[PDB]
Amino acid sequence: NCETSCVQQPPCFPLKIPPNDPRIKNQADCIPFFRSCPACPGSNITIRNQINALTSFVDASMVYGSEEPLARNLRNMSNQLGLLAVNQRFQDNGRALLPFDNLHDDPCLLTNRSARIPCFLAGDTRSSEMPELTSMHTLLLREHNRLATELKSLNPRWDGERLYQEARKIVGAMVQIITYRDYLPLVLGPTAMRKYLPTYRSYNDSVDPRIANVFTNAFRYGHTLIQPFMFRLDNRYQPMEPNPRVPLSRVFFASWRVVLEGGIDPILRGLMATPAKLNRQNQIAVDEIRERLFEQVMRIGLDLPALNMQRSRDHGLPGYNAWRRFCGLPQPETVGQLGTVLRNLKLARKLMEQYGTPNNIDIWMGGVSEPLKRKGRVGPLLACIIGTQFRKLRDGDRFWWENEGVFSMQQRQALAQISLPRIICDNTGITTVSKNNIFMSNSYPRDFVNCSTLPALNLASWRE
Amino acid sequence: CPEQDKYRTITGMCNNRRSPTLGASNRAFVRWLPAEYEDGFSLPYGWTPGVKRNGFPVALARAVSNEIVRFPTDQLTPDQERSLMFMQWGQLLDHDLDFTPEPA
Ligand SMILES: *[C@@H]1O[C@H](CO[C@@H]2O[C@@H](C)[C@@H](O)[C@@H](O)[C@@H]2O)[C@@H](O[C@@H]2O[C@H](CO)[C@@H](O[C@@H]3O[C@H](CO)[C@@H](O)[C@H](O[C@H]4O[C@H](CO)[C@@H](O)[C@H](O)[C@@H]4O)[C@@H]3O)[C@H](O)[C@H]2NC(C)=O)[C@H](O)[C@H]1NC(C)=O
Ligand code: HEM
Ligand SMILES: N[C@H](c1ccccc1)c1ccccc1Cn1c(=S)[nH]c(=O)c2[nH]ccc21
Ligand SMILES: *[C@@H]1O[C@H](CO)[C@@H](O)[C@H](O)[C@H]1NC(C)=O
Ligand SMILES: *[C@@H]1O[C@H](CO)[C@@H](O)[C@H](O)[C@H]1NC(C)=O
Ligand SMILES: [Ca+2]
Ligand SMILES: [Cl-]
Ligand SMILES: [Cl-]
Ligand SMILES: [Cl-]
Ligand SMILES: [Cl-]
């Protein structure tokens, strides 16, 4: 058991502790780590590869599931309305919550022993990892059900299957629209956006849409954006007393907080009205994830940045220079050359002290170290890895929302009006939301508008 | 695969008609570069004591975190041009794309 022992035997690869560690004084101790499952267990022929349990497609599989048994169980089969099942014990001011899951070892039950609130059941197993995440999962559960209701009013003959499929199709297209129109340009910046994501032409069945092993580690660049608190705000966007800034180490798998501390409205307002943390070369990641990750459900606090580096080794990922070469970027060899690439000689020196060669720098470490692209939140290397992946997921998707035959021209025109602040307006008791772009806007009342100024999705073109 | 369809399958199977498991769930990741393991095929770097990576000692992930990632929280810089929703969409989006299973 990798959670309870420090023995380095299958399937464990514990993180060894350095001398004079600022937290772990006993070098005989470790950080828990289970190696990712191999694609071919016990093989003496294969080069170890890892599995992706999910559909690589931007198809909202985190809502619907990636396996048929789970997808069936996430649906309400008690009628023909084509709805997703909702919580049968609790509601958020009369609004739907995700149903609870039945976990053998339920970590949510450990976050507050007395509340006895288990983990939520969604399309992906991590929905409860943080209440802010649970809130986004809850929002989409409600959007599906809201679409299915409006689709039933428009097409009364349509059965349960048809209503579920048509609402699922709209939700997937909304996740694709918010990702590529609003999210990805602010990740990459305009230069890398133009280079790696050029204007969509059409579906190309020769574009491999699989997630690359490197992407599972590169996309963890987002851990540098994590604030050390969960921020909850009331209907005036003011700190919601008595717990406005709850430390992140006290919110992991804390599903009891959504259920017993005010639902998803204070959480969504906190996400909209609080700035992200900015990644800086001497301010990479907070101790809330570096020292206290999963503090309430593990024998010790985990170190997310260190887990990322161990994970890249577990996965046999090549080092920084090999990924620089893959991306056609110069490969620094000297501490001076690294100093120039990073525009930071002090950091290049620390990286060289740690690794000895830039060839060995772990992909996440090297990737997050790079200065950020103009109007972007990643350096050249992460922009190449992220941009390449998202271009493949778009060009290799037969069900891409702009692919000919997926939607009609009138439906595409209707879908181009959607936005995340509008989904928040339609599925919560929140009446004031961020101005577009929601991912940029962060100051209340300055970047805020009332829901009444935003047009709803027109379903007129879905009438059969 | 059925010659004609209207919606995606749940597993992602049949999205690519020529190679119908591409992008489908419970399938191996694609490798953009060949793997680099201590023994060449399975053991990770840092596994065996004394075994160096490309001429240098393997740096403990925890030591890299302490020396490079660690910073005083009082110095945190809020992003003037990004909301915390920007971080949150990133995790939710990641959770539509990949989950690397581990034994429980
Ligand atoms: C449909 O999509 C496939 C795959 O696209 C690839 O991935 C995408 C995500 C994106 O990055 C694309 O830009 C990328 O191509 C396309 O098929 C690929 O097409 C290129 C160009 O034809 C192929 O590259 C070739 O590889 C040869 C290896 O045998 C090599 O000989 C070629 O180079 C030589 O010849 C050219 C021309 O004379 C010369 O300029 C070179 O300098 C060199 O001498 C060339 O590099 C890819 O291998 C193809 N990939 C696959 C998987 O088949 C396809 O074209 C695209 N179709 C449309 C209509 O968009
Ligand atoms: C509250 C925010 C976040 C977390 C808590 C969190 C935690 C993790 C953990 C523990 C892992 C696995 C660690 C390991 O390798 O052993 C993890 C993996 C991944 N994340 Fe994390 N994450 C939080 C938030 C984000 C954000 C904002 C991300 C991107 C913008 C992000 C990405 C990822 C990805 C892609 C992975 C790998 C997932 C996989 O299993 O394939 N995370 N995160
Ligand atoms: N074993 C994890 C645990 C966490 C706390 C207590 C007990 C056990 C775990 C449980 C449920 C879902 C996911 C995970 C790990 N996990 C998380 S939280 N996030 C990722 O992105 C991820 N990828 C692979 C794995 C994983
Ligand atoms: C299914 O839908 C009905 C009608 O909205 C609702 O009352 C019921 O609780 C739902 N069942 C589940 C399991 O979600
Ligand atoms: C645990 O949950 C209960 C509600 O059931 C709450 O009153 C209590 O304050 C919680 N514990 C802590 C330490 O917050
Ligand atoms: Ca998916
Ligand atoms: Cl329930
Ligand atoms: Cl997670
Ligand atoms: Cl409000
Ligand atoms: Cl790879």
- Ligand 2 centroid – CA A220 distance (Å): 6
- List CB contacts (< 8 A) between A442 and chain B: 79-84
Measure Cα distances from A93 to A99, A257, A427, B26, B33 in Å.
Answer: 16, 14, 12, 38, 50
Task: Characterize A224-262 residue by residue with b for buried, 16 or more Cβ atoms within 10 angstroms of its Cβ, and e for exposed.
Answer: bbbbbbbbbbeeebeebeeebebebbbbbbbbbbbbebb
- Encoded amino acid at A383, one letter: A
- Ligand 10 centroid – CA A211 distance (Å): 9
Measure Cα distances from A186 to A2, A180, A242, A291, B27 in Å.
Answer: 38, 10, 34, 29, 31
- Ligand 10 centroid – CA A60 distance (Å): 23
- Given the DSSP bridges, would you call strands A51-52 and B27-28 parallel, antiparallel or unpaired? antiparallel
CB within 8 Å: A317 and B56: no
CA-A253 nearest atom, ligand 3: 5
User: Cα separation of A452 and B8, whole Å?
Assistant: 34
- Encoded amino acid at A274, one letter: T
Write out the two tokens for B67.
Answer: 């020396």
CA-A293 nearest atom, ligand 2: 5
- List CB contacts (< 8 A) between A401 and chain B: none
Q: How far is A376 from chain B (nearest CA, A)?
A: 10
Contact of A312 with A363, CB cutoff 8 Å: yes
Query: Which residues does A20 contact at the CB level (< 8 Å), separation at least 6?
Result: none
**A 262-321: CB under 8 A from B:** 270-278, 280, 282-288, 290, 303, 305-310, 313-319
Containing B78, the helix (H) or strand (E) segment is strand B78-83
Positive or negative CA dihedral for A459, A457, A143, B27?
Answer: positive
User: Cα separation of B83 and A275, whole Å?
Assistant: 4
**Radius of gyration from C-alpha coordinates of chain B:** 21
CB within 8 Å: B58 and A66: no
Measure Cα distances from A216 to A310, B20, B94 in Å.
Answer: 13, 22, 8
Contact of A366 with A356, CB cutoff 8 Å: no
Q: Which ligand is nearest to the CA of A90?
A: 7
**Radius of gyration from C-alpha coordinates of chain A:** 23
Structural domains in chain B (count): 1
Nearest CA in chain A to B11: A66
Mutate to test the pocket of ligand 1, among A195, A197, A203, A207 (most ligand atoms within 8 A of CB): A207
Nearest to B83 among A175, A310, A434 (CB): A434
Q: What are phi and psi of A426, to 5 degrees?
A: -85, -15
Query: Which residues have CB less than 5 Å away from ligand 7 (the ion)?
Result: A 87-88, 99-100
B74 labeled binding residue: no
Resolution for the entry shown, Å: 2.1
Q: CB burial class (10 A; 0-12, 13-18, 19+) of residue A201? A: exposed
The size of the A-B interface in CB pairs under 8 A is 387
A236: domain range? 1-464
**Is A41 part of the contact surface with chain B (CB cutoff 8 Å)?**
no
Q: Is B95 a catalytic residue?
A: yes
User: Cα separation of A228 and A247, whole Å?
Assistant: 6
Method by which the coordinates were obtained: X-ray
Q: Classify B53 as helix, strand or coil.
A: strand
Residue A314: CATH number of its domain: 1.10.640.10
User: Cα separation of A430 and A360, whole Å?
Assistant: 48
Secondary structure in 3-state letters for chain A: CCCCCCCCCCCECCEECCCCCCCCCCCCCEECCECCCECCCCCCCCCCCEEECCCCCCCCHHHHCCCHHHHHHCECCCCCCCCECCCCCCCECCECCCCECCCCCCCHHHHCCCCCCCCECCCCCCCCCCHHHHHHHHHHHHHHHHHHHHHHHHCCCCCHHHHHHHHHHHHHHHHHHHHHHHHHHHHHHHHHHHHHCCCCCCCCCCCCCCCEHHHHHHHHHHHHHCCCEEECECCCCCECCCCCEEEHHHCCCCCHHHHHCCCCHHHHHHHHHCEEECCECCECCCHHHHCCECCCCCCCCECHHHHHHHHHHHCCCCCHHHHHHHCCCCCCCCHHHHHHHHCCHHHHHHHHHHHCCHHHCCHHHHHHHCCCCCCCCCCHHHHHHHHHHHHHHHHCCCCCCCCECCECHHHHHHHCCCCHHHHHHHHCCCCEEECCCCCCCCCCCCCEEEHHHCCCCCCHHHCC
Measure Cα distances from A455 to A74, A376, B5, B48, B65 in Å.
Answer: 30, 29, 32, 61, 46
Structural domains in chain A (count): 1
Q: CB burial class (10 A; 0-12, 13-18, 19+) of residue A37? A: middle
User: Cα separation of A447 and A99, whole Å?
Assistant: 34
Of B18, B62, B82, B95, the active-site residue reads B95
Measure Cα distances from A84 to A56, A130, A172, A395, B98 in Å.
Answer: 22, 22, 15, 29, 22
Write out the two tokens for A149.
Answer: 């209701």
Does any ligand 2 atom lie closer than 6 A to the CB of residue A290? no
How far separated are the first and last CA of chain B, in Å rounded?
34
Contact of A11 with A2, CB cutoff 8 Å: yes
Write out the two tokens for A318.
Answer: 């090549």
Query: Which residues does A410 contact at the CB level (< 8 Å), separation at least 6?
Result: A460, A461
How remote is the C-alpha of A311 from its chain's centroid? 17
User: Cα separation of A233 and A214, whole Å?
Assistant: 37
Measure Cα distances from A284 to A38, A39, A145, A366 in Å.
Answer: 31, 33, 39, 12
